[PDB]
Ligand binder design. Structure first.
Ligand SMILES: Nc1nc2c(ncn2[C@H]2C[C@H](O)[C@@H](COP(=O)(O)NP(=O)(O)OP(=O)(O)O)O2)c(=O)[nH]1
Ligand SMILES: [Mg+2]
Ligand SMILES: [Mg+2]
Length: 430
DNA sequence: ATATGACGCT
DNA sequence: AGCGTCAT
């Protein structure tokens, strides 16, 4: 009752760019705008693999991971942009730089946690508090929320999408209690107003559109964001959670899309997030461990406490290439040469990072995958990163992995390598 | 033949 | 330290 925490203490948003790599390419090449478009890596094998898809192209059934040749069967007029290739590998610099454009704008509004190349969490609790004082108990006009959906509304006693959106927003705003500066629903609403402003700034200053979720924690904000993509934002209130979760597959919640979510489903014999409320915290901990059990118990009630970490920069800087099928590296010369290529890209990115961000990496992690191994990494080894020198880094990387070669012959490498991955880590201020 | 980032477990 | 998980 009076002592039961409701997880309504924060206002958290998740902003995620719409078909991000596609928009980067469309901004650069106007011919690609408002068309079925995708971004692909490489070209020779089946036209290249698709990693981003415009919403026009999604309507034809084009998806991530599809070969471009196959996508063209679904969508004959599909337009394609190719990721830059440098030193024989994909070079994502253009998208990293576009990412920085967007992150720097978001950082004007609040503390952000960079969560991927195209999304950040925003802790809006403080910004909301101050905007509420500036408000002076003034009601919030629907005009301040022109792209916002209120999840779960409208309800009770129109046939077009925008009509529905407005009806729900009207019901929400009509019920809002603006006299109470501590109403979590009011706080979320003000959060949504700020996120409209943030999203307008991003679009004005970069040309890129994005979607957002506004809720009380990161998991609900992320879930909310996806509900009305593209170019819209969604408010998920604490009160919306029971109905929302009552038919929400467990795998849709962040961190439950993998083996843990599958075991929840299998062990408990349930399908939906809301069904978790029926178990005690101890029961959940008995099946999934102390940490996961506590997290699940709280999360199925809409409660989560993971903070928005003050971190706009990546923690590691890495370079990797897969060598699939018959391209697997099978000679020592092959292995040293590709380590050199990776290390040259890494050197350029590290030197740039040191100039921009006043820090230096101090450890180099070398990861490989061997043919026949379905794991991401077959083996990781580390060494000291003392110099931003590509020849030294590649030589050192070879030194720490050369043991893995089970070949009796000098020139040969076995088992053949299906991935090389260099990652610079353990940054120190510089 | 579906680049590379954060983080947990031991 | 090195491996496993989840993710975009
Ligand atoms: N090299 C590479 N890039 C990838 C991969 N997966 C995603 N990207 C790149 C490509 C993505 O454009 C970008 C952002 O990932 P999302 O936010 O999950 N998808 P998007 O923004 O495209 O569409 P929307 O959010 O509207 O659903 O990350 C991959 O597996 N490999
Ligand atoms: Mg996106
Ligand atoms: Mg994303």
């Amino acid at each position: 009752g009076p002592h039961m925490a409701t997880g309504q203490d924060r206002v958290v948003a998740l902003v995620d760019m719409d078909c991000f790599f596609v928009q980067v390419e469309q901004r650069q090449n106007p011919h690609l705008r408002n068309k079925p478009c995708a971004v692909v890596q490489y070209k020779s094998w089946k036209g290249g693999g698709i990693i981003a898809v415009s919403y026009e192209a999604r309507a034809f059934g084009v998806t991530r991971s599809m070969w471009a040749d196959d996508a063209k069967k679904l969508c004959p007029d599909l337009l394609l942009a190719q990721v830059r290739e440098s030193r024989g590998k994909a070079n994502l610099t253009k998208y990293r730089e576009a990412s920085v454009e967007v992150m720097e704008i978001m950082s004007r509004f609040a503390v952000i946690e960079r969560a991927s190349i195209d999304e950040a969490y925003v802790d809006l609790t403080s910004a909301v508090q101050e905007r509420l004082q500036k408000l002076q108990g003034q009601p919030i006009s629907a005009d301040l929320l022109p792209s916002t959906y209120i999840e779960g509304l409208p309800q009770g006693p129109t046939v077009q999408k925008e009509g529905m959106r407005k009806q729900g927003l009207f019901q929400w705003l009509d019920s809002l209690q603006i006299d109470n500066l501590t109403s979590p629903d009011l706080q979320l609403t003000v959060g949504a107003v700020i996120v409209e402003e943030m999203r307008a700034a991003i679009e004005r200053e970069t040309g890129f559109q994005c979607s957002a979720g506004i809720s009380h924690n990161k998991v609900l904000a992320k879930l909310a964001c996806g509900l009305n993509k593209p170019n819209r934002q969604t408010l998920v209130s604490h009160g919306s959670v029971p109905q929302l979760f009552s038919q929400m597959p467990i795998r849709k919640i962040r961190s439950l899309g993998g083996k843990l979510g599958a075991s929840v489903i299998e062990i408990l014999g349930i399908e939906y997030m809301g069904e978790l409320t029926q178990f005690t915290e101890s029961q959940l901990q008995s099946h999934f461990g102390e940490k996961n059990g506590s997290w699940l118990y709280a999360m199925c009630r809409g409660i989560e406490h993971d903070p928005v970490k003050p971190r706009q920069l990546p923690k590691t800087i890495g370079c990797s290439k897969n060598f699939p099928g018959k391209t697997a590296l099978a000679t020592r010369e092959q292995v040293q040469w590709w380590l050199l290529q990776l290390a040259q890209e890494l050197e350029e990115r590290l030197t740039k990072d040191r100039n921009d961000n006043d820090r230096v990496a101090t450890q180099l992690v070398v990861s490989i995958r061997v043919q026949g191994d379905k794991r991401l990494s077959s083996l990781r080894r580390c060494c000291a990163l003392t110099r931003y020198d590509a020849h030294k880094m590649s030589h050192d990387a070879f030194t720490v992995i050369k043991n893995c070669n089970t070949s009796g012959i000098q020139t040969e490498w076995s088992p053949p390598l299906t991935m090389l991955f260099l990652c610079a880590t353990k940054f120190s201020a510089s």
